[model samples]
Target: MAPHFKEELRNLNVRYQSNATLVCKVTGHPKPIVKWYRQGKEIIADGLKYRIQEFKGGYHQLIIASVTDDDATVYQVRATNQGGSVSGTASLEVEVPAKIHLPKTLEGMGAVHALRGEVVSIKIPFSGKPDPVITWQKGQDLIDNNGHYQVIVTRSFTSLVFPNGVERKDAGFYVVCAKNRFGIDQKTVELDVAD
Candidate 1:
């Protein structure tokens, strides 16, 4: 009972603002028939549109059909047995952005309306290129933030501070979505929350 080869790979759930990483872990044993290469080149037979799942214990995952730059490389996990093959090098960088470009200018901050209780502030100043993923929506139908909104996700930049002592369905209209990786760019704001 002396056969222990461990493994732990990552990139779970990240979608919506999409950073691309459903899961990728390939453990071993005789079960190390695992394969995925990127410096030697050979990614799951390449029909493209990747997504391989086998969860619950011996996790092995890969989901990437779209998200290019060659899906960003330096990825590897090749393990073969009969006491021979072993390779490790997983560094697939998908630096945030599935669809983004919403920053007409968040210089001195803009757009605010409240009354029921008041306290919703946003401070912004943005820049991009492969760097951006800040989302704040509500008039688009909820997600300006609930549970009193105080969201911050950094790398590029994102800060949304909303202290809604106000109600009235939080009024209407408010949108801020700035994504990256070269795509989408949108902004719409018109909030009027009254007591």
Candidate 2:
């Protein structure tokens, strides 16, 4: 007569700033005490942010409201009684919008300096739940890879390279855009060319 899970918990994927619920069922010879945990830390019912509920037939539920990126982790439920104990676990993932990663020091001023008739290259890092499409623009014109300009994209970073070297005309504000189904993120950097 050890406590056992009748139904196992399944992984959940929720949008950012949304609510999520994890539920399972357990049965035992004697009534078992149920407890919930997140990332191996015991979770307490705070009534506002967290709630623990039980229904007839040993159905237990853990509710979380206003979930953020921090809530993405492993969740577990344990049932214990005099006979024995049982546990079930599930993982939660939060889908978020595209984000551009920039250094704190460059937040106020993001500029790149290059010498006239020299090769210019710029690389930027970005992240998102789903892979984002990267695009580059110079002023109002969209840039494309050609004999002079080269665009390279990777899993976590994007680069724009001028293999033929840069001229005064290339000096301007260059924008890098990251877009996905969730949202769009962009960053602008000024390229200063000097003779």
Candidate 3:
């Protein structure tokens, strides 16, 4: 029988103002020289920019000061010895709070840039005194018009996800209407289809 091992990572994605760590494990012969990469470059051993430490029970650790796009990509591991080496790749996808460019209706969320045939997901981030009731609208029409879109309203946001992605017909104004006992708010974005 051949030697085998399993290594895994969690919290690969992190918010810009938040922190996260990765985890890994192995059960192969001779252990392995565990390494980390940013996008694909080997991390240096100095400062918070790049640091590696060994821990108890045969494990290597990597600490990242922050998870940036530069810090996003597939991480790899290589177990080597005079006998040979085995390697594997692990993918990491991160999500930082996207910068918001909102004009002052105050309560707002933003849209995602989607390619033709690619599913589009829209989320609106909002805040209010009495909180708010959220609704999805298409060009001044209530979203339930023909059940063409799915809407999920939550405390922090109202999300519109296109299960089949966007077709040429999907290019139009998508609006999130927020209302409270006191007042109402509306925000809209234009989704342009690729030619």
lDDT string, candidate 3, 1-195, tens digits: 122335655546554434345556655456556656655576676866656767666565666667655456677655554456655566555554322223333224344456787877676676543456777778887785244577766656767877777888898877777776556777787666785
lDDT value for candidate 2? 0.87
Taking all chains together, each candidate's TM-score versus the true structure is: 0.34, 0.64, 0.45
**Candidate 1: tens digits of C-alpha lDDT, residues 1-195:** 212225645423222333355344445455556676667877774445765656755566666666645566666656565656765565555544434334443433345666776766555445444666677777565464558777666654565666656567765656777766656565665556765
Candidate 1 residues lying further than 4 Å off, grouped into runs, are 1-75, 79-83, 88-90, 95-114, 121-159, 162-184
Task: Output the number of the TM-score-best candidate.
Answer: 2
Q: How many residue pairs clash in each candidate?
A: 5, 0, 3
lDDT of 2 by residue, 1-195 (tens): 789999988899998788889999999979889999998899999998899889999999998998877898999999999999878999999887887775432545357889988888787888777778899998879999977789989988888888888888888888889999899998887888998
- Which parts of model 3 are misplaced by more than 4 Å? 1-4, 28-31, 101-195
Q: Name the regions of candidate 2 deviating beyond 4 angstroms.
A: 99-127, 131-136, 140-171, 181-195
**Ten residues in a row with the worst lDDT in model 2?**
101-110
lDDT of 1 at 20: 52
Cα lDDT over the full model 3 = 0.61
Distance (Å) between predicted and true CA of 69, model 2?
Answer: 1.1
